[PDB]
From a paper:
The crystallized export complex included the Pdr6•RanGTP subcomplex and S. cerevisiae eIF5A lacking its 15 N-terminal disordered residues. We eventually obtained hexagonal crystals of the ternary RanGTP•Pdr6•eIF5A complex that diffracted to 3.7 Å. The structures of the Pdr6 and Ran molecules within the ternary export complex are almost identical (RMSD, ∼0.25 Å and 0.15 Å, respectively) to that of the Pdr6•RanGTP heterodimer. In the yeast eIF5A export complex, Pdr6 grasps eIF5A by N- and C-terminal arches, in particular, by the inter-repeat loops of HEATs 8–11 and the last helix of HEAT 20. Pdr6 interacts with both domains of eIF5A, namely, with the N-terminal SH3-like domain and with the C-terminal oligonucleotide-binding (OB)–fold domain. However, unlike Xpo4, Pdr6 does not shield the hypusine-containing loop. The N-terminal SH3-like domain of eIF5A constitutes the larger interaction interface and sits on a concave surface made up of the inter-repeat loops of HEATs 8–11. Most of these interactions involve hydrophobic contacts and are centered on W506Pdr6 and K69eIF5A. The OB-fold domain is clamped between the N- and C-terminal arches of Pdr6 and positioned directly adjacent to Ran. Ran does not only interact with eIF5A directly but also promotes Pdr6-eIF5A contacts by bringing the N- and C-terminal arches of Pdr6 (which stay apart in the Pdr6•Ubc9 complex and probably also in Pdr6 apo structure) closer to each other.
S. cerevisiae Pdr6/Kap122 was originally identified as a pleiotropic drug–resistance protein and subsequently as an importin β superfamily member. Furthermore, we found that Pdr6 imports Ubc9, exports eIF5A, and thus, combines functions of Imp13 and Xpo4. Pdr6 is an all α-helical protein built of 19 canonical HEAT repeats followed by three helices (termed HEAT 20) at its very C-terminal region. The transport signals recognized by Pdr6 are folded domains.
Numbering used by the authors:
A (entry chain B): 8 to 178
B (entry chain C): 17 to 153
C (entry chain A): 3 to 69, 78 to 129, 137 to 155, 162 to 262, 269 to 328, 343 to 775, 786 to 1039, 1044 to 1076
Write the structure that this text describes.
């Protein structure tokens, strides 16, 4: 039983709570309920090398409901920055969330996630992302409604936190 | 708007009217049936607005329509419901020009939302006007 | 109680804590800010025995100052106190203690932003760097007062750099302040003057400190590189700040950085800084420094030595970043290079001194474009150069006709043809073969596909310059004048020519897509001059399809050869219409492969998914050929329908997708059988209808429907949809109109009763896929141009009775948007014969009854209903205005939905009221009634706007602007009356927007609105 701390950050309305609820209960939340403070939940993944327990901390993207806002980043072993491809403002704030994480931690693996790719009208092109040029930074187009690239971010985090790139979730 | 010119005198770079559409000629070829028979020019061109390929094969000494292509500069002052409201150096505002598509319109809405000074080079051929180039200082 | 606080603080950061993490987190949010929370944080920082995590939470507890003017001063004193404390413990020997150091920097930066805002008092800070400098000099509390706002000179600032960590703390402080000012500027723009404060004091100190790190050797520290990038980002977002000498000293440092001296570490960081400038704000660098960058990059030369260092050491990632920086640098000079090349309007005349310089300039750029070391796997120079040559092609196309050079067309043809000769071996499938062999199924395959797509668009832009004879005829004559396979069955046996012909087929396809092969006789002339062209195209298809997949590389390449071949064959459909006798070898070759992938059942084990992909690509090309060559493929109709009767059997090895596209292909051929009259064509249509409906009823009543039968029924339903779409007359008479209006064969009766038999089953009506495909078939004849003798054109009563039949027994959550979208098609079709009483009937049965239970609390169904009403307002407003539920239901409900929490719901409601106000299709009586009703609920409405605008956050402000703009423009008088009542309820400063917004009228609101949101947010 090996566990890691995951911190999920991003602007409000990017689907962070919907993303963790889709991986936990398999349900897609249609209504938007702004997360108050932080919500930490466990996620179990059975890989070829055993079970992995990710403690996902869904933070609050709003400045009002932020709470500790960076105290959640202490002792964080991995991070996921989520933005909305339908809202340019959500993508332009990615360097802000990335900076607050590099201020607390230093080289924890961080996964960039553009949510709502299933939307026909997309305001954030996939070619504009240049953040994947770092060894600890990787981008994935995900869709919480259509489960597009469902387990891709957790798989990359598992490969970086363990060191076995051949390991996959096939449970 | 358009002027007649002999098909044999048509350039490989100039503009011509094909199927009631202005088109920039990309290649000009000429062929002959017999030595005593008259020749014929085969023109291929790109639609100056839609970008589609249009071509026509017409005999020599035949007159073709050549449009008057104008490239004008207007400072972009507004984007209203997909219509570019531009400002001329004389003080007149044209909101009839629609916003272009593709990466051109995406870069226009991006730079206009950022607040930078944007100049638009628009091409007017015959009865259609559309934004083409962008300039920023 | 402080020992209890530290207990649960350490409990929060433990790996597996007790009771709960969420509760102790909420309790931690409860301790602050209250009158001991500030003092608790100071005690957590002053105590040296506490852990680093506990002290970090103390700096975090201090950060909460948003909860009057005196507590800010009492805080800033203790911020600088704990500042000097930990910042003295660092430089001697502590290590890993700079985390709280950075947090205290962030807190002081927020203080610098808040205090320097417009509003016994406090005078501005002006310079936190200087204040931090003198705090390292230790009657006691009196020092902080005079040290704060006025401080020493630069010579003492250099004296601070006696140690290395001192310079590191100063560099980090300037970086954190700048990065926080960047986050504050990006969040909300209320600054406007603090930048001037930074420009007058902080800008001078940072430039003198950074330039000191660059010029002085002992003071140099690599941390300044990360600090320069931070400053450049803040300058690029705001605005004159020079940075010119900084770039100059960075060039001198980068040029001095070699393998032996620095190991190209500083050169790498400076290239990252320059790469950020060129890619984001290249105008920040002057023309002179860009000329120095040109002489260093393009020149033995220093750039060649660094490139050889990266290649010989096999550093491909750093070489990739180098290519990105150079390309982004050359992309900003595109217009200058294109002008000095192909036009004569530039600086110099009669030389020509610049030409031999620019001829060598392009020559070197072509040498870098070629660049040994195969692509993606090793280098990215060619990958990024694609965007550069694309801009040059568009720039050359945009040049004026009278300004072109005499040799412009010749020089453009020569250069761009060399580009073709360079990029054709670049996108060769041998590169992808080595990628799948070495790196496997990694992201390099995806980047190689993006590289091929980028070169495909490059060729599409180059065709407008090279033309057909210099670009298209080069590919056709290259593969058309020589046979690729001399032996029968078209087996190439050779890998080099196979990769060469596949590259030429891919480029030729992307070029021919931009054409129209029907109006063009040129395509017939160039192909008839090539004997082996069509033979080689089928040779590519047959070689790839018949290639045995042993490894994974040969399997993926097999899919690539079939993909490129099947795509080009589909593009050549226009030429096949001009040359019908060349169509026969393709159909047989496709159906032979279609049978090759059908009658074989060996599946070990994922070979069937590659088999299905091949079967999908084959049937797609057959659908494309049948779409254009409907008339030419008439003799194959009797053979295809016979083949369809064997495929539609429930026991078969074909996939469901190929069944749908086959029926679409057969329907394409049947559609062109309108010659012999409606009777002969209806024989095929009735046969296909009885075959599809017969197989559906056969499957529903025998083997009680499981998941397999659900996919089979869904497949046949989609087949009926493909048959309905294929039979639509292309946009490119009365005997058919009177026949299909009577339809003696009862085509609509059989199809409608078949859809009814499927939707009458409880296992199907509550499934969204069957409801979706059901509403598609019924709405196929809707919104078609009047006069077209369509067979499946349904009237209003038939579609009405259809929706009323299956709407109660289905799942209202997932299946309602399909019935409503079908109703929108019926409304737009019968807009002339519609009645407001009939609109009330549809609104009550389909929407109103299911509203209070299933719609009001569902965002998807909510936006569905709003989009329905917006469609009625777009088509015929008289139906919605003359509704019994207009004033009783529609207006009150949509009034409450204005401050919704969903973005798409906000855009839906905002578009509703915007269309309701800005509608130009209103009658004069309708316009008076609308203005009367809007004036009745105007007060409640403006309250909902400001209520949503207040409670919302960024990225949804614009959706309200369009609404507020229309309400002010249409009702300017009552706008002030409604604002003076709604503003105080949702303080006094809000009145400022009233004068400034109504004065604008329209077209530049929002800018006035966010300056109101920014004010009304802080409070
Ligand atoms: N169409 C579509 N909508 C989505 C998708 N993912 C999320 N959404 C919607 O986005 C909304 C955002 O909900 P949240 O998960 O609460 O947003 P958040 O990122 O957690 O932001 P906070 O709650 O403030 O922390 C949800 O109501 C979803 O309906 C998606 O993949 N596709
Ligand atoms: Mg959330």
């Amino acid at each position: 039983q090996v566990q890691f701390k995951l911190v999920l950050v991003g602007d409000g309305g990017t689907g962070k709570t919907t993303f963790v609820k889709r991986h936990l209960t398999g349900e897609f939340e249609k209504k938007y309920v702004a997360t108050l403070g932080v919500e930490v939940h466990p996620l179990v993944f059975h890989t070829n090398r055993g079970p992995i327990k990710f403690n996902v901390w869904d933070t609050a993207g709003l400045e009002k409901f932020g709470g500790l806002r960076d105290g959640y980043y202490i002792q964080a072993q991995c991070a996921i920055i989520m933005f909305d491809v339908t809202s340019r403002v959500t993508y332009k704030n990615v360097p802000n969330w990335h900076r607050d994480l590099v201020r607390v931690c230093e080289n924890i693996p961080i996964v960039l996630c553009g949510n709502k790719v299933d939307i026909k009208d997309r305001k954030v092109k996939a070619k504009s992302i240049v953040f994947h040029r770092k060894k600890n930074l990787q981008y994935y187009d995900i869709s919480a409604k259509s489960n597009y690239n469902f387990e891709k971010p957790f798989l990359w985090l598992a490969r970086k936190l363990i060191g076995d790139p051949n390991l996959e979730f096939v449970a | 708007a358009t002027y007649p010119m002999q098909c044999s005198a048509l350039r490989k770079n100039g503009f011509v009217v094909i199927k009631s559409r202005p088109c920039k000629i990309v290649d000009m070829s000429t062929s002959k049936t017999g030595k005593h028979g008259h020749a014929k020019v085969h023109l291929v061109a790109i639609d100056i607005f839609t970008g589609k390929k249009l071509e026509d094969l017409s005999p020599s000494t035949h007159n073709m329509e050549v449009p008057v292509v104008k490239r004008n500069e207007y400072q972009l002052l507004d984007i209203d419901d997909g219509f570019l409201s531009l400002m001329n150096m004389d003080g007149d505002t044209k909101d009839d020009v629609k916003a272009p598509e593709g990466e051109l319109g995406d870069s226009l809405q991006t730079a206009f939302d950022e607040g930078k000074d944007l100049m638009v080079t628009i091409i007017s051929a015959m009865g259609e006007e559309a934004a083409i180039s962008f300039k920023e200082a | 109680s402080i020992h209890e606080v530290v207990a649960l603080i350490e409990e929060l950061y433990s790996p597996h804590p007790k009771h709960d993490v969420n509760q102790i987190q909420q309790s931690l949010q409860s301790i602050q800010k209250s009158e001991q929370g500030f003092h608790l944080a100071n005690e957590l920082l002053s105590d040296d025995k506490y852990s680093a995590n506990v002290k970090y939470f103390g700096a975090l507890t201090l950060t909460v100052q948003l909860n009057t003017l005196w507590n800010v001063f009492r805080s800033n004193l203790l911020y600088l106190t704990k500042f000097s404390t930990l910042y003295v413990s660092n430089p001697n020997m502590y290590g890993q203690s700079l985390i709280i150091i950075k947090k205290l920097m962030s807190n002081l930066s927020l203080i610098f932003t808040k205090i320097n805002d417009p509003q016994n008092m406090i005078k501005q800070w002006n310079n936190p760097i200087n204040t931090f400098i003198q705090l390292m000099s230790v009657a006691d509390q009196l020092l902080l007062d005079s040290i704060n706002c006025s401080l020493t000179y630069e010579q003492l600032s250099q004296f601070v750099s006696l140690s290395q960590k001192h310079n590191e703390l100063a560099l980090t402080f300037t970086e954190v302040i700048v990065e926080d000012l960047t986050k504050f500027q990006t969040k909300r723009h209320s600054m406007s003057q603090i930048h001037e404060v930074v420009h007058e004091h902080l800008y001078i100190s940072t430039m003198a400190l950074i330039n000191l790190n660059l010029t002085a050797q002992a003071v140099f520290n690599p941390t300044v590189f990360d600090c320069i990038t931070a400053w450049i980002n803040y300058i690029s977002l705001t605005r004159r700040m020079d940075l010119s000498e900084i770039f100059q000293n960075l060039i001198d440092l980068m040029y001095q950085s070699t393998e032996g001296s620095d190991g190209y570490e500083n050169a790498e960081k400076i290239l990252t800084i320059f790469g950020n400038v060129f890619a984001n704000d290249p105008l920040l660098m002057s023309y002179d420094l860009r000329q120095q960058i040109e002489c260093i990059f393009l020149g033995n030369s220093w750039m060649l030595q660094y490139m050889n260092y990266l290649v010989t050491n096999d550093f491909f990632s750093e070489l990739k970043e180098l290519a990105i920086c150079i390309v982004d640098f050359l992309q900003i000079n595109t217009l200058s290079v294109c002008n000095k090349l192909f036009t004569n309007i530039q600086a110099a005349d009669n030389g020509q001194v610049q030409d031999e310089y620019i001829q060598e300039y392009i020559k070197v750029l072509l040498q870098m474009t070629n660049f040994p070391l195969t692509p993606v796997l090793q280098e990215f120079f060619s990958v990024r150069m694609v965007d550069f040559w694309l801009d040059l092609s568009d720039a050359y196309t945009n040049l004026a006709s009278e300004t072109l050079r005499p040799n412009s067309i010749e020089l453009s043809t020569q250069i761009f043809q060399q580009l073709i000769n360079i990029y054709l071996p670049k996108i060769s499938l041998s590169v992808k073969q080595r990628i799948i062999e070495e790196e496997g199924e990694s992201t390099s395959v995806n980047e190689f596909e993006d590289f091929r797509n980028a070169v495909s668009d490059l060729a599409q832009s180059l065709w407008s310059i090279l033309g057909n004879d210099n670009l298209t005829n080069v590919l056709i004559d290259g593969m058309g004048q020589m046979p690729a396979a001399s032996d029968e069955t078209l087996i190439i046996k050779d890998t080099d020519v196979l990769f060469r012909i596949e590259t030429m087929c891919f480029v030729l396809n992307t070029i021919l897509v931009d054409m129209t092969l029907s109006e063009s006789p040129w395509i017939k002339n160039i192909v008839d001059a090539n004997k082996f062209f069509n033979q080689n195209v089928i040779s590519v298809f047959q070689t790839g399809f018949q290639t045995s997949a042993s490894t994974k590389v040969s399997q993926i390449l097999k899919l690539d050869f079939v993909r490129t071949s099947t795509t080009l064959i589909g593009t050549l459909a226009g030429y096949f219409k001009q040359e019908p006798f060349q169509l026969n070898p393709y159909v047989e070759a496709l159906f032979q492969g279609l049978h090759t992938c059908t009658n074989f059942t060996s599946k070990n084990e994922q070979e069937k998914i590659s088999n299905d992909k091949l079967e999908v690509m084959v049937i797609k090309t057959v659908s494309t050929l049948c779409e254009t060559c409907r008339e030419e493929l008439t003799p194959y109709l009797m053979h295809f329908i016979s083949f369809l009767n064997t495929v539609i059997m429930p026991d078969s090895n074909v996939s469901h997708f190929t069944r749908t596209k086959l029926v679409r292909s057969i329907g394409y051929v049947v559609q062109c059988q309108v010659s012999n009259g409606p009777e002969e064509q209806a024989k095929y249509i009735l046969q296909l209808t009885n075959l599809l409906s017969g197989s559906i009823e056969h499957c529903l009543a025998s083997s009680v429907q499981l998941q397999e039968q659900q996919d089979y029924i869904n497949c046949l339903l989609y087949c009926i949809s493909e048959l309905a779409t294929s039979l639509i007359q292309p946009t490119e008479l009365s005997e058919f109109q009177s026949f299909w209006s009577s339809d003696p064969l009862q085509i609509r009766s059989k199809i409608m009763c078949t859809i009814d038999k499927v939707l009458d089953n409880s296992i199907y009506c509550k499934n969204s896929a069957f409801v979706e495909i059901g509403c598609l078939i019924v709405g196929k004849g809707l919104n078609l141009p009047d006069g077209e003798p369509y067979f499946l054109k349904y009237n209003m009563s038939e579609v009405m009775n259809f929706v009323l039949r299956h709407v109660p027994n289905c799942e209202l959550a997932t299946c309602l948007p399909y019935f409503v979208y079908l109703l929108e098609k019926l409304i737009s079709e019968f807009r002339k014969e519609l009645t407001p009483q009939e609109f009330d009937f549809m609104f009550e049965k389909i929407l109103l009854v299911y509203y209070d239970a299933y719609i009001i609390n569902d965002p998807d169904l909510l936006q569905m209903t709003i989009g329905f009403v917006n469609n009625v307002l777009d088509v015929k407003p008289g139906l919605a205005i003359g509704s019994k539920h207009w004033t009783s239901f529609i207006l009150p409900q949509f009034l409450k939905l204005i401050p919704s929490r969903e973005k798409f719901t906000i855009v839906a409601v905002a578009k509703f009221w915007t269309k309701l106000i800005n509608n130009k299709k209103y009658n004069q009586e309708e316009l008076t009634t609308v203005r009367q009703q809007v004036s009745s609920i105007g007060g409640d409405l403006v309250y909902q706007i400001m209520y949503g605008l207040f409670h919302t956050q960024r990225s949804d402000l614009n959706s309200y602007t369009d609404l507020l703009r229309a309400l002010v423009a249409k009702f300017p008088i009552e706008a002030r009356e409604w604002l003076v009542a709604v503003l105080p309820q949702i303080a006094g400063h809000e009145k400022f927007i009233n004068k400034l917004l109504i004065t604008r009228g329209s077209r530049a609101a929002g800018n006035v609105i966010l300056q109101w949101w920014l004010d009304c947010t802080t409070l």
